[model samples]
Target: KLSLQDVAELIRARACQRVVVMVGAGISTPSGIPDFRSPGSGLYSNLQQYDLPYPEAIFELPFFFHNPKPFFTLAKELYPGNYKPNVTHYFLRLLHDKGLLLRLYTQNIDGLERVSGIPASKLVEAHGTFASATCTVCQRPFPGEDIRADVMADRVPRCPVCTGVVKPDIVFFGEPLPQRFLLHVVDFPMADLLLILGTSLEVEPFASLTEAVRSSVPRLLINRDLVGPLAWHPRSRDVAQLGDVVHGVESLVELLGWTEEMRDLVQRETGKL
Candidate 1:
């Protein structure tokens, strides 16, 4: 594991300009949201009582139409509450505040990054999130909070005007990921540094992004496991290692002598350092 100082040195060396941050569920776990596939910590383990054919099936549009109950039941527990931003989230916002971040592409549905104060222009919720709700029948939209009452009550939230079921804007199992993610991939080669944080890098499309960047650009991975064969492959030199997102970012900031700026930014955003 790299020490905080060592990570900070790398950050300083990069100067952190024109950086692309690709984050995933692990980055939001500290905020009380669960990763979908991390063994016992994932929603799959917690959802066993639903007895669905597959853990993710409940999120599919077609399946949801048949039985919205299970999803509603699950939502009551997962819905945003008083969940606060974690250190990694604050670090990303810090980068944005300092104008070092080019963009943030996230696979999480928590929407916590936006809540953490990263501007919408600087962030992309790639897999969609609970930022909005949509009526399945009329296709009308509602504020996420409008439906939270029903979600918290384990009932299918419906649109007030049309009585249509309203579901969070997250991409369902069979849905296409946010179109902005594709746009980002096509544009990623222009970035100077690409940071892959807290993701296993196993999911398709999203995983391919790391390979799409220019090989000369610095690529960093801060996750629990090295996904797939990339770590052992001869071309592994392209990957720079940061053990985990939270502490890894702290180290990187320190090494780069960004502690003061980082602290100021955090304090400004959350009123704490």
Candidate 2:
């Protein structure tokens, strides 16, 4: 456990003021959503029923275009419901409300962070989410409600304007990630700190954002496992520590004791202890 003094020292460093948070599916697992790549716990282990030649094929753009059924079938299970935000999501929202969060870059497609009340402007849903939909044929966009309805019905929603098949805006194989993701990464080195949470950091492009930061910027990793080798580059002074997201947030709250205002915001949003 990190002591209160340790947390105070880090927070008093005000290193968190210009902080950027990079998150992944593990952050939303508490909301009853499964990640895609984790051993036995992710969607990969459950894909056998779909008869997909490759687990990722269900999300591949080419495969989706050829057979939209499988993708739609999977969407039915992953769509948003009455699920509530977890402590990690609320913790980040609290940081943002306090003006300590610079940007939140997340790889989750669950859209729970936004539902947790984090402003869309402050977040970069890097892999895209179930937040919006677009027609594959004519590239028209639809409201999130329309997409949700079609997804729940297990049917490909068509663009009313062009009759094009609408697909969720997530980044699938062969699809480019949102342009904003690259823009933020280019600006990462200027941040005072980078807080990576619940991510494996194994996915390409998204995983490489951390390397864009200047060596002077401090980094903190809170996750179940480590990715990439930990080697000291002469110019960089950083460390990757392991801890569960919930535990890390609790430790930080205990140490910083930030402001009551901050704590109140977290309670209102996350219902955390």
Candidate 3:
């Protein structure tokens, strides 16, 4: 078990040329976004008002084709403009600014990363995001803005080309992940450092990414708990910094002497949002 100081020193020495950051729900908690599937407080748990076959069914592909009402209703509340980005998100942008970020793979659909100014080219939203949507029938792409009104009004956005349901590019329970994820999958092996943040590391494919990098590549896990492959690493290079996401990022930023930059960034960018 390595201390955060050890990880900080390695980062300071510029030993990691390519850093791949994988993030999950914990990072957005400070922004007032609750964990998606957690019992009682999760968006899934409070979905009893939807009257669906199951709470998670709203995100299931087949259920969505049957009744899109519940998902759209939830969408109106979750649209990106409704929330502000927090420190953890800014830290990701900071890593990009410092030219250390190779790619940001996320399980979040909130689009806060884009809101925080990380270019779409450097992002791989693993479960998809609100940035774009597609027709389920014709698979035609639909601009997020084009469907904003419908989404905000709790109406299902339909595809103009085929009159099919336009679901945000999120990965539903039964849906295959986006092709973009596959293309970026190769980047993991090239990553000199893997940053595991916020996520519980419970889901497949995304969870499996922890093993994607070379066995020697250092993996830094900053989460509230130890719950992933990183926790059981066979090498000493793996470091776990357990706590709130914001606190962990802030500590790393402070160690990296990026505190001033982080503060200025948070003030400047948050005002624009």
Clashing pairs in 1: 4-251, 7-252, 8-251, 8-252, 8-255, 8-256, 9-255
Residue 30 CA error for candidate 2 (Å)? 1.6
| Reference-based lDDT, each prediction | 0.73, 0.74, 0.84
Candidate 1: stretches off by over 4 Å: 1-16, 49-53, 232-236, 240-243, 260-273
Tens digits of per-residue lDDT, candidate 1, 1-273, equal: 333344355557665468888888889776666777778878678666775767768668788888888877766665665566787888888788767788899877766787788988888888787868889889898888888777876777878889988888888865788767766855697787777788877666777777766765666677777754357542433455545667777766776667888777667766532
Error of 1 at 8 (Å): 5.2
Steric clash count of candidate 2: 0
- Per-candidate TM equals 0.84, 0.85, 0.91
RMSD of each: 3.3, 3.4, 2.1
Model 1 / residue 123 / CA error / Å = 0.8
Residues 174-236 of candidate 3 have per-residue lDDT tens digits of: 578888788555898789988999888878788888888887787888888887776675467
Top of the candidates by lDDT: 3
Deviation from native of the Cα of residue 69 in model 3, angstroms: 1.9
Clashes of 3: 0
